[PDB]
Amino acid sequence: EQISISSPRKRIYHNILETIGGTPLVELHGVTEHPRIKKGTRILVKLEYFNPMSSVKDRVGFNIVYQAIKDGRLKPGMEIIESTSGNTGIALCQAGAVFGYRVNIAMPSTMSVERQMIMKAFGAELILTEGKKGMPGAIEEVNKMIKENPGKYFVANQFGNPDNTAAHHYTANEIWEDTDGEVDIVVSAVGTSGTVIGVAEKLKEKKKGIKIIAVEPEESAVLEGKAKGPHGIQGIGAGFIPDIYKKEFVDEIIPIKTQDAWKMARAVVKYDGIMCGMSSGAAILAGLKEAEKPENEGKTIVIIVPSCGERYLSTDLYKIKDEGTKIQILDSLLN
Amino acid sequence: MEQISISSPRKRIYHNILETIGGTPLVELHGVTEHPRIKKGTRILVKLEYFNPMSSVKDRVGFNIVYQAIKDGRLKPGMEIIESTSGNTGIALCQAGAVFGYRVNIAMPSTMSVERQMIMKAFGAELILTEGKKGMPGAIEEVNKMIKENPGKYFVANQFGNPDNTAAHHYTANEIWEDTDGEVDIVVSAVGTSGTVIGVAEKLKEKKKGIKIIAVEPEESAVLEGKAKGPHGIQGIGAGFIPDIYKKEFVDEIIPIKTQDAWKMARAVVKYDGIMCGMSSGAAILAGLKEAEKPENEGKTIVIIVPSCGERYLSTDLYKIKDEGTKIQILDSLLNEHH
Ligand code: MET
């Protein structure tokens, strides 16, 4: 019943990029109080919105740009360019501001207006594309832009760039150390797939039997072999299988309905006080569905939370009001 | 170019989100400090309170107010929490109430911070929306009515007069002390409740003689300096009165900062250091740069509090002006006042 807040970090950080990563792992309790989830089963959420720009992509924009500069692929005189669903452009704006490079962006018009609003203040340059066409339309927008041109642009290429995936070797080490090697299952909702694959490949170097679970929208279940379809889980469901995706590293794929992802997110902020985004609601409902399986009794389940509900205020995330008690709401999610 | 390394694993599993409050990072500024009148020796650091789980310094305050009340019995099963607030304190109370299992009632004018309304409601709060024309005093009047009519039912957070607000910042002070290895010379804090500036001064003045403590307030509403209350646009500070928890003896100097400068400074910080701080952080940073230019402060370590981040200000005019000028023109225009 005693509660201790966080101790001093005992570091002076040399710039904001050094504050990326080392995100906290937090036990869920409110949404896990359910007669089928057994007491020894631990459900932990890794809160990637503790990154300075509040999303998992901070690690991505940082590693892509910093390696490209160390590489020679980004050099003084070039600009950065990319297509995103939002968070990646914001992470590249952060790295761009620190390193001193200009940044240009293409993104679907349908993504929350909060995302559009962050880019620019840092020093970027935007282009909003058609919703309907989704991430592929953004990508085409980007190709257009480079086509011509010189050897002037470095293209971040977040769906095909292995520096995306490799940034999540740190994510995996943090899960390993924070759980003292006890993690059994990791659940990650998939956009670029750099988190699920980067985490999986680094954790399999640690312990072979860790189960890795990808999550995607039921309405666009492309990893499971379905076609691209309209969905509302912002930040995931790219509509294609990213070139960095490595299926041999993923044990199971869970489809989650858009409405259910949102409703889970509603429940997590109400019963645990954790303000997770839409794709977090998908990941957490998948993880809860794992936690009620009798073969997972006593296991440690780690669920990636990629973003904060506050970047979604303009959406319908917090529109509908759920009826029922806590137990009613959880029953409706699990059945 | 230096090796940049990211943060190491926390090596902790947190029992709930309130355990992730505090231990906020202290970060060097470089881009906005590159001006001839600031010396290569002096260290200008920002403590980023938006690393709290709800992205502001008030997480500490909502947590400690509710925690301390539970511990000493001012808050007991059955009662509900209430506060009149349209800002971060409201969010911070909702967070704490969500985890502790207590209902949270937040009163504010129906027309203020409807984004912040939504956040509060998402956390399960009852919002008490009062008449628009009446401003904050109408919210306070409603909370006064509700507590008068329901004796014993509510616990009033009372952020401007609660010593548990100031006391939470002994932790802030300790983080400053350990993170600088005792080298901190000056702390700059923009003042809302004054919990931060006083609670940090109380504890640091115990560590070492000679730590200068600087309060920052809007030039247009310089009530700590004894001017009259006035309209200003630096959200989160300039409450219009001297808060009950303010202790003037612990504050060495007060710096007035104009609203438009506070905004322009916040824009420069995100552009040149890539740190997306909020409006009151633009005020405190500009005050701190003005310190770093004083010849007597050469080689000193200056710590500036950054209470919130720019994402909570997207519907304001914070990022509407697009400043013309290269970096050096902008910093020179921000530091150029005489006296
Ligand atoms: C919808 S596919 C994943 C795109 C990624 N969420 C980005 O921030 O750009």
XYZ file of C-alpha atoms and ligand atoms in Angstrom:
683
model
C 0.000 0.000 0.000
C 2.998 2.409 0.253
C 3.820 4.301 -2.958
C 7.278 5.625 -3.892
C 7.725 7.966 -6.796
C 10.728 7.828 -9.184
C 14.247 8.499 -7.927
C 16.649 11.023 -9.516
C 18.080 9.830 -12.876
C 21.625 11.031 -11.826
C 22.451 11.985 -15.461
C 22.665 15.330 -17.194
C 21.547 14.639 -20.769
C 23.606 16.437 -23.498
C 20.491 17.003 -25.700
C 16.820 15.746 -25.904
C 17.752 12.656 -27.995
C 19.659 11.176 -25.069
C 16.298 11.097 -23.182
C 14.829 8.697 -25.804
C 14.277 5.056 -24.633
C 14.543 3.537 -21.061
C 10.659 3.750 -21.033
C 8.839 2.418 -17.983
C 7.280 -0.983 -17.572
C 3.995 -0.699 -15.504
C 1.724 -3.413 -14.138
C -1.874 -3.321 -15.127
C -4.387 -3.906 -12.301
C -7.727 -2.316 -13.024
C -8.412 -4.025 -16.321
C -6.930 -7.288 -15.135
C -9.276 -7.774 -12.167
C -11.156 -10.641 -13.729
C -11.995 -14.028 -12.286
C -10.272 -15.886 -15.244
C -7.004 -13.930 -15.058
C -5.112 -15.732 -12.392
C -3.285 -13.905 -9.639
C 0.220 -15.019 -10.637
C -0.168 -13.981 -14.304
C 1.522 -10.560 -14.691
C 0.283 -8.123 -17.334
C 2.786 -5.224 -17.854
C 2.609 -2.356 -20.306
C 5.681 -0.652 -21.706
C 4.815 3.027 -22.066
C 6.505 4.397 -25.158
C 4.832 7.748 -24.787
C 7.435 8.519 -22.067
C 9.794 9.288 -25.045
C 10.272 13.081 -25.427
C 7.770 13.447 -28.285
C 5.429 10.871 -26.736
C 5.677 8.013 -29.063
C 7.599 4.860 -29.873
C 8.765 6.546 -33.185
C 11.122 8.793 -31.278
C 13.531 5.797 -31.203
C 12.974 5.335 -34.978
C 13.427 8.928 -36.221
C 16.538 9.173 -34.009
C 18.261 5.937 -35.152
C 17.442 6.448 -38.852
C 18.828 9.951 -38.955
C 21.800 9.448 -36.628
C 22.959 6.331 -38.465
C 22.506 8.002 -41.823
C 24.726 10.865 -40.644
C 27.340 8.476 -39.220
C 27.042 6.511 -42.506
C 27.466 9.223 -45.038
C 23.961 8.701 -46.279
C 22.922 12.046 -44.800
C 25.482 14.784 -45.152
C 25.652 18.499 -44.803
C 23.690 20.033 -47.587
C 20.942 17.334 -47.875
C 17.289 17.482 -46.534
C 15.265 14.641 -44.958
C 12.067 13.397 -46.478
C 9.460 10.817 -45.555
C 5.733 9.449 -45.393
C 4.142 8.714 -42.312
C 0.957 8.139 -40.342
C 2.169 10.887 -38.068
C 4.441 9.833 -35.291
C 7.397 9.078 -37.565
C 7.286 12.602 -39.116
C 7.240 14.115 -35.588
C 10.252 11.877 -34.526
C 12.176 12.915 -37.696
C 11.362 16.651 -36.940
C 12.837 16.153 -33.405
C 16.061 14.483 -34.792
C 16.188 17.074 -37.628
C 16.009 20.027 -35.199
C 18.821 18.585 -32.985
C 21.148 17.610 -35.865
C 20.370 20.684 -37.987
C 18.631 19.233 -41.006
C 15.417 20.297 -42.701
C 12.584 17.838 -42.859
C 9.734 17.227 -45.342
C 6.660 15.155 -44.844
C 3.726 13.308 -46.612
C 0.790 11.858 -44.508
C -2.913 10.766 -44.986
C -5.484 13.683 -44.520
C -7.490 11.306 -42.254
C -4.804 10.954 -39.472
C -5.588 13.088 -36.342
C -5.066 16.888 -36.796
C -2.908 16.911 -33.608
C -0.205 15.093 -35.665
C -0.380 17.696 -38.454
C -0.146 20.419 -35.864
C 3.106 19.251 -34.235
C 5.126 19.182 -37.466
C 6.237 22.638 -38.567
C 6.788 24.256 -35.173
C 10.065 22.331 -35.167
C 10.943 23.496 -38.651
C 9.394 20.963 -41.058
C 7.222 21.186 -44.298
C 3.880 19.236 -44.850
C 1.790 17.432 -47.514
C -1.487 15.786 -46.745
C -2.680 13.019 -48.924
C -5.959 11.211 -49.668
C -7.548 9.030 -46.997
C -8.786 6.076 -48.798
C -5.381 5.609 -50.317
C -3.795 5.510 -46.893
C -0.141 4.763 -46.320
C 0.436 3.648 -49.947
C -0.883 7.034 -51.187
C 1.544 8.850 -48.875
C 4.353 6.652 -50.140
C 3.473 7.436 -53.772
C 3.353 11.111 -52.819
C 6.911 10.746 -51.548
C 8.227 8.981 -54.709
C 6.809 11.732 -56.814
C 8.725 14.267 -54.841
C 12.123 12.541 -55.098
C 11.653 11.207 -58.626
C 13.303 14.201 -60.318
C 15.719 15.835 -58.052
C 19.271 15.270 -57.220
C 21.290 13.563 -54.668
C 19.808 16.145 -52.302
C 17.315 14.040 -50.196
C 17.779 11.324 -47.700
C 14.651 9.221 -47.656
C 13.889 7.811 -44.128
C 12.069 4.814 -45.731
C 10.584 3.635 -42.398
C 8.932 0.498 -43.846
C 12.118 -0.752 -45.542
C 14.881 0.724 -43.369
C 16.654 -1.800 -41.021
C 17.687 1.095 -38.716
C 14.014 1.125 -37.761
C 14.092 -2.495 -36.661
C 17.531 -2.177 -35.024
C 16.392 0.745 -32.783
C 14.182 -1.862 -31.073
C 17.154 -3.862 -29.878
C 17.147 -1.280 -27.086
C 13.420 -1.779 -26.594
C 14.065 -5.530 -26.199
C 17.021 -5.072 -23.744
C 14.808 -2.802 -21.598
C 12.082 -5.478 -21.473
C 14.726 -8.164 -20.592
C 16.363 -6.173 -17.813
C 13.216 -4.666 -16.423
C 11.573 -8.099 -16.074
C 14.873 -9.658 -14.892
C 14.649 -12.206 -17.682
C 11.098 -13.264 -16.684
C 9.191 -12.006 -19.755
C 7.291 -14.854 -21.439
C 5.072 -13.152 -24.086
C 5.428 -9.827 -25.911
C 2.410 -8.281 -27.710
C 2.947 -5.540 -30.239
C 0.458 -3.846 -32.539
C 2.059 -3.634 -36.024
C 2.544 -0.531 -38.213
C 5.989 -0.586 -39.718
C 6.687 -3.837 -37.719
C 10.060 -2.486 -36.567
C 9.003 -2.896 -32.872
C 7.669 -6.499 -33.139
C 10.632 -7.702 -35.237
C 13.383 -5.735 -33.518
C 12.111 -6.805 -30.107
C 11.644 -10.427 -31.258
C 15.054 -10.820 -32.800
C 16.877 -9.367 -29.755
C 14.741 -11.317 -27.240
C 15.324 -14.620 -29.158
C 19.009 -14.009 -28.641
C 18.153 -13.891 -24.954
C 15.779 -16.866 -24.566
C 14.277 -19.007 -27.413
C 10.867 -19.751 -25.918
C 9.524 -16.171 -25.668
C 6.216 -16.009 -27.494
C 5.919 -12.958 -29.872
C 2.429 -11.825 -30.826
C 1.599 -9.291 -33.576
C -1.666 -7.418 -33.523
C -3.476 -5.811 -36.475
C -6.980 -4.418 -37.256
C -9.577 -7.040 -38.028
C -10.642 -4.776 -40.889
C -7.238 -4.806 -42.534
C -5.659 -8.097 -41.540
C -2.841 -8.027 -44.079
C -0.331 -9.942 -41.991
C -2.849 -12.818 -41.841
C -3.185 -12.702 -45.645
C -6.355 -10.569 -45.959
C -6.561 -7.453 -48.090
C -6.138 -3.784 -47.172
C -9.423 -2.442 -45.896
C -10.750 0.732 -44.131
C -10.169 0.672 -40.401
C -9.802 3.124 -37.624
C -6.845 1.954 -35.509
C -4.591 4.922 -36.104
C -0.913 4.116 -36.265
C -1.285 0.515 -37.465
C -2.800 -1.378 -40.448
C -0.442 -0.024 -43.139
C -2.368 -1.991 -45.790
C 0.743 -4.054 -46.990
C 3.388 -6.222 -45.446
C 6.349 -3.939 -44.712
C 9.675 -5.035 -46.260
C 11.212 -5.091 -42.760
C 8.670 -7.610 -41.523
C 10.141 -11.050 -40.812
C 7.360 -13.608 -40.311
C 9.654 -16.297 -38.822
C 10.046 -14.093 -35.740
C 6.302 -13.801 -35.062
C 4.500 -16.693 -33.305
C 0.876 -15.605 -33.548
C -1.118 -12.737 -35.169
C -4.201 -11.382 -33.371
C -6.845 -9.343 -35.287
C -8.684 -6.784 -33.161
C -11.772 -4.858 -34.233
C -11.372 -1.035 -34.464
C -14.322 -0.448 -32.095
C -12.936 -2.913 -29.566
C -9.405 -1.314 -29.659
C -11.030 2.010 -28.855
C -13.224 0.619 -26.173
C -10.257 -1.118 -24.499
C -8.363 2.170 -24.467
C -11.294 3.779 -22.794
C -11.226 1.129 -20.103
C -7.429 1.327 -19.518
C -7.499 5.126 -18.795
C -10.589 4.738 -16.577
C -9.527 1.698 -14.501
C -5.705 1.973 -14.473
C -5.270 5.756 -15.026
C -3.098 5.088 -18.027
C -3.967 7.310 -21.027
C -3.028 4.981 -23.914
C -3.740 5.555 -27.620
C -5.852 3.523 -30.039
C -3.282 0.967 -31.142
C -2.455 0.413 -27.418
C -6.079 -0.538 -26.844
C -5.692 -3.217 -29.612
C -2.398 -4.488 -28.104
C -3.773 -4.559 -24.568
C -6.997 -6.368 -25.497
C -4.867 -8.985 -27.315
C -2.687 -9.277 -24.174
C -5.737 -9.678 -21.937
C -7.082 -12.407 -24.265
C -3.666 -14.133 -23.734
C -3.885 -13.661 -19.948
C -7.176 -15.577 -19.633
C -5.788 -18.714 -21.401
C -5.170 -21.508 -18.904
C -1.794 -22.440 -20.524
C -0.558 -18.839 -19.703
C -1.243 -19.028 -15.941
C 1.624 -17.406 -14.026
C 3.325 -16.050 -17.196
C 4.713 -12.526 -17.586
C 3.050 -10.792 -20.501
C 4.592 -7.501 -21.768
C 2.432 -5.287 -24.060
C 3.880 -2.355 -26.073
C 1.934 0.942 -25.607
C 3.047 3.089 -28.539
C 1.307 6.445 -27.911
C -0.968 8.636 -25.456
C -4.584 9.246 -25.895
C -4.043 13.070 -25.980
C -2.833 12.877 -29.586
C -6.330 11.534 -30.403
C -8.656 14.046 -28.791
C -9.936 15.196 -32.259
C -10.894 11.581 -33.161
C -13.832 9.430 -31.908
C -11.615 7.549 -29.331
C -13.374 9.215 -26.363
C -16.730 9.821 -28.181
C -18.912 6.801 -27.302
C -19.728 6.147 -23.686
C -19.683 2.527 -22.634
C -22.542 1.152 -20.529
C -22.101 -1.181 -17.611
C -19.839 -1.785 -14.627
C -16.117 -2.538 -14.994
C -16.844 -6.294 -15.048
C -19.552 -5.799 -17.761
C -17.171 -3.801 -19.945
C -14.389 -6.374 -19.593
C -16.824 -9.238 -20.338
C -17.968 -7.447 -23.430
C -14.318 -7.074 -24.563
C -13.288 -10.687 -23.818
C -16.293 -12.427 -25.419
C 30.557 14.620 -33.828
C 30.053 13.104 -30.319
C 28.619 9.696 -29.582
C 24.923 10.247 -28.642
C 23.575 7.411 -26.490
C 20.039 6.917 -25.457
C 18.762 6.120 -21.953
C 19.453 2.848 -20.193
C 16.736 0.513 -18.914
C 14.993 1.755 -15.765
C 15.470 -1.712 -14.141
C 12.162 -1.393 -12.215
C 8.633 -2.646 -12.749
C 6.236 0.063 -11.572
C 3.254 -1.100 -9.454
C 1.032 1.590 -11.095
C 1.430 4.815 -13.086
C 1.889 7.033 -10.008
C 5.245 5.384 -9.356
C 6.511 6.846 -12.665
C 5.977 10.421 -11.402
C 9.115 12.397 -10.728
C 12.779 11.624 -11.555
C 12.431 13.949 -14.488
C 15.420 14.579 -16.815
C 17.832 17.467 -16.692
C 18.909 18.370 -20.214
C 21.525 20.806 -21.518
C 20.449 23.587 -23.870
C 22.926 24.382 -26.706
C 21.071 25.897 -29.656
C 19.435 28.794 -27.819
C 22.527 29.559 -25.761
C 24.744 30.407 -28.795
C 24.903 34.147 -28.482
C 27.978 36.309 -27.889
C 26.875 37.507 -24.440
C 26.596 33.984 -23.019
C 29.916 32.376 -21.996
C 31.138 28.920 -23.217
C 31.610 28.083 -19.459
C 28.137 28.577 -18.114
C 25.772 25.585 -17.979
C 22.186 26.092 -18.867
C 19.951 23.133 -18.100
C 16.225 22.480 -18.313
C 14.328 20.019 -16.096
C 11.622 18.648 -18.249
C 8.534 18.145 -16.103
C 6.570 17.035 -19.083
C 8.299 13.580 -18.629
C 5.623 12.982 -15.896
C 2.992 10.385 -17.063
C 0.465 13.213 -17.809
C 3.055 15.666 -19.227
C 3.278 18.351 -16.558
C 4.735 19.293 -13.245
C 1.244 18.985 -11.618
C 1.404 15.195 -11.678
C 3.633 15.564 -8.577
C 1.070 17.895 -6.966
C -2.129 15.941 -7.686
C -0.318 12.848 -6.533
C 1.019 14.286 -3.257
C -2.176 16.175 -2.309
C -4.250 12.981 -2.604
C -1.593 10.637 -1.168
C -0.896 12.825 1.919
C -4.635 13.284 2.531
C -5.172 9.499 2.421
C -2.231 8.953 4.738
C -3.326 11.498 7.390
C -7.045 10.748 6.972
C -8.328 13.938 5.334
C -9.416 11.661 2.457
C -11.273 8.460 3.378
C -13.363 5.876 1.544
C -16.713 7.493 0.841
C -15.497 10.973 0.091
C -14.898 12.495 -3.311
C -12.192 14.825 -4.491
C -13.091 18.293 -5.796
C -11.152 21.199 -7.239
C -11.771 24.235 -9.332
C -9.130 24.183 -12.062
C -9.122 24.374 -15.833
C -5.548 23.106 -16.211
C -2.963 20.534 -15.448
C -3.832 20.276 -11.750
C -7.215 18.932 -12.830
C -5.582 16.239 -15.016
C -3.162 15.362 -12.209
C -6.005 14.956 -9.661
C -7.898 12.693 -12.139
C -4.857 10.505 -12.635
C -4.287 10.107 -8.847
C -8.061 9.521 -8.206
C -8.183 6.880 -10.987
C -5.378 4.888 -9.335
C -6.426 5.388 -5.689
C -10.089 4.557 -6.461
C -11.678 7.919 -5.646
C -14.186 9.959 -7.594
C -12.904 13.288 -8.932
C -15.036 16.323 -9.503
C -13.523 19.114 -11.463
C -15.138 22.565 -11.849
C -14.275 24.993 -14.611
C -15.973 27.510 -16.919
C -17.877 25.616 -19.743
C -15.920 27.457 -22.373
C -12.342 26.867 -21.169
C -9.945 24.141 -22.371
C -12.455 21.725 -23.938
C -9.466 19.519 -24.928
C -8.611 19.387 -21.221
C -12.280 18.614 -20.522
C -12.087 15.560 -22.708
C -8.845 14.367 -21.022
C -10.498 14.727 -17.590
C -13.673 12.959 -18.596
C -11.599 10.115 -20.119
C -10.100 9.605 -16.674
C -13.621 9.248 -15.228
C -13.998 12.762 -13.717
C -17.343 14.496 -13.207
C -16.999 17.903 -14.776
C -18.816 20.798 -13.084
C -19.112 23.271 -15.946
C -19.842 26.802 -14.755
C -20.984 29.924 -16.587
C -18.533 31.160 -19.182
C -18.736 34.938 -18.497
C -17.916 34.222 -14.840
C -14.475 32.746 -15.424
C -12.543 30.926 -12.664
C -14.331 32.806 -9.849
C -17.656 31.180 -10.979
C -16.016 27.723 -10.755
C -14.758 28.481 -7.216
C -18.256 29.786 -6.308
C -19.797 26.557 -7.474
C -17.266 24.400 -5.546
C -17.879 26.570 -2.462
C -21.662 25.874 -2.854
C -21.226 22.142 -3.315
C -19.045 21.809 -0.213
C -21.429 24.053 1.894
C -24.437 21.930 0.942
C -22.619 18.576 1.336
C -20.572 18.883 4.557
C -18.089 16.064 5.000
C -18.580 14.723 1.454
C -15.673 16.372 -0.416
C -11.943 16.804 -0.108
C -10.812 20.079 -1.605
C -7.416 19.901 -3.227
C -6.823 23.677 -2.649
C -3.683 23.856 -4.844
C -2.866 27.522 -4.019
C -2.968 26.947 -0.242
C -2.077 23.230 0.281
C 1.372 22.696 1.867
C 1.421 19.188 0.262
C 1.888 21.091 -3.063
C 5.189 22.746 -1.836
C 6.247 19.549 -0.068
C 6.107 17.501 -3.319
C 8.886 19.695 -4.662
C 11.373 18.525 -2.051
C 11.680 15.627 -4.472
C 12.107 18.037 -7.406
C 14.861 19.715 -5.371
C 16.570 16.461 -4.581
C 16.628 15.488 -8.264
C 18.220 18.863 -9.086
C 20.817 18.353 -6.340
C 21.787 14.792 -7.288
C 21.592 15.309 -11.085
C 24.025 18.298 -10.845
C 26.204 16.545 -8.245
C 25.610 19.544 -5.980
C 26.879 22.014 -8.623
C 23.489 23.794 -9.148
C 23.957 27.589 -8.641
C 20.686 29.122 -9.826
C 17.087 27.735 -10.201
C 14.596 29.604 -12.377
C 10.888 28.786 -11.933
C 7.849 30.473 -13.579
C 5.237 30.841 -10.821
C 1.607 29.553 -10.851
C 0.848 28.139 -7.347
C 4.477 28.716 -6.394
C 4.686 25.074 -5.086
C 7.763 24.523 -7.361
C 9.818 27.640 -6.612
C 9.228 27.486 -2.797
C 9.497 23.727 -2.265
C 12.682 23.603 -4.385
C 14.155 26.702 -2.451
C 13.209 25.182 0.978
C 15.152 22.011 0.233
C 18.096 23.376 -1.800
C 18.844 26.194 0.683
C 19.432 23.310 3.140
C 22.067 21.770 0.857
C 24.356 24.734 0.195
C 24.716 28.422 0.831
C 24.541 30.655 -2.241
C 21.951 28.985 -4.543
C 20.105 31.818 -6.142
C 16.353 31.293 -6.485
C 14.485 33.221 -9.232
C 10.695 33.447 -9.633
C 9.270 34.415 -13.105
C 5.937 36.113 -13.716
C 4.228 37.859 -16.669
C 5.300 41.486 -17.160
C 1.597 42.384 -17.434
C 0.523 40.813 -14.162
C 3.466 41.277 -11.874
C 1.706 40.653 -8.560
C 4.711 39.077 -6.835
C 6.623 42.319 -7.520
C 3.630 44.173 -6.122
C 2.176 45.499 -9.426
C -1.519 45.075 -10.107
C -3.107 41.967 -11.653
C -3.593 42.245 -15.471
C -4.511 40.233 -18.596
C -1.551 38.221 -20.059
C -1.268 35.145 -22.310
C 1.365 33.026 -20.508
C -0.860 30.068 -19.651
C -0.120 28.268 -16.335
C 1.357 31.247 -14.528
C 0.320 34.799 -13.451
C -2.580 33.690 -11.236
C -3.347 37.381 -10.387
C -2.695 37.078 -6.645
C 0.144 36.029 -4.328
C -0.653 32.363 -3.459
C -0.983 31.436 0.242
C 1.928 28.961 -0.121
C 4.287 31.651 -1.511
C 7.150 32.493 0.936
C 8.949 35.595 -0.318
C 12.035 35.065 1.916
C 13.000 31.969 -0.081
C 13.028 33.873 -3.410
C 16.118 36.013 -4.300
C 14.844 37.793 -7.447
C 11.717 38.033 -9.513
C 11.909 38.442 -13.322
C 8.884 39.829 -15.319
C 8.655 38.369 -18.877
C 6.294 39.733 -21.578
C 3.811 37.296 -23.039
C 5.008 37.723 -26.595
C 8.606 37.068 -25.569
C 7.640 33.933 -23.627
C 5.943 32.581 -26.746
C 8.831 33.572 -29.085
C 11.358 31.933 -26.721
C 9.312 28.651 -26.711
C 9.314 28.703 -30.529
C 13.111 29.182 -30.621
C 13.683 26.316 -28.134
C 11.742 23.777 -30.216
C 13.396 24.971 -33.494
C 17.020 25.161 -32.217
C 17.186 22.607 -29.457
C 14.287 20.433 -30.551
C 12.664 20.634 -27.176
C 8.979 21.280 -27.508
C 8.420 23.232 -24.266
C 5.200 25.157 -23.327
C 4.397 28.832 -22.826
C 5.451 29.195 -19.188
C 8.699 27.290 -20.120
C 9.355 29.931 -22.784
C 9.115 32.508 -19.928
C 11.449 30.628 -17.543
C 14.020 29.790 -20.248
C 14.199 33.493 -21.367
C 14.667 34.534 -17.710
C 17.423 31.915 -17.415
C 19.223 33.020 -20.573
C 19.147 36.587 -19.182
C 20.924 35.150 -16.151
C 23.451 33.290 -18.195
C 24.421 36.559 -19.837
C 25.292 38.315 -16.483
C 29.086 38.445 -16.178
C 28.858 37.509 -12.481
C 27.179 34.169 -13.596
C 30.000 33.002 -15.840
C 30.727 29.277 -15.328
C 27.647 28.872 -13.092
C 25.096 25.958 -13.424
C 21.650 27.390 -14.104
C 18.610 25.048 -13.792
C 15.362 26.111 -15.394
C 12.044 24.389 -14.728
C 10.058 23.417 -17.869
C 6.563 22.676 -16.556
C 4.750 21.423 -19.666
C 5.115 20.678 -23.342
C 3.909 22.573 -26.464
C 1.462 19.817 -27.507
C -1.024 21.022 -24.906
C -1.046 24.474 -26.687
C -1.782 23.513 -30.250
C -5.130 25.388 -30.239
C -3.446 28.602 -28.937
C -1.421 31.208 -30.896
C 1.792 29.805 -29.507
C 2.863 28.522 -32.940
C 0.968 30.993 -35.146
C 3.736 33.609 -35.680
C 6.449 32.247 -37.931
C 9.508 34.298 -36.816
C 11.647 35.748 -39.570
C 15.388 35.744 -38.929
C 18.224 33.340 -38.633
C 18.910 31.776 -35.187
C 21.299 34.620 -34.153
C 18.746 37.300 -35.108
C 16.060 35.624 -33.029
C 18.207 35.151 -29.906
C 19.595 38.679 -30.196
C 15.989 40.004 -30.495
C 14.974 38.063 -27.354
C 17.944 39.208 -25.250
C 18.070 42.814 -26.374
C 16.286 44.750 -23.638
C 18.502 47.125 -21.645
C 18.836 47.522 -17.877
C -0.095 3.025 -40.455
S 1.511 2.240 -40.828
C 2.628 2.878 -39.560
C 3.056 4.322 -39.831
C 3.645 4.868 -38.564
N 2.604 4.724 -37.455
C 4.147 6.304 -38.674
O 4.219 6.994 -37.649
O 4.469 6.831 -39.731
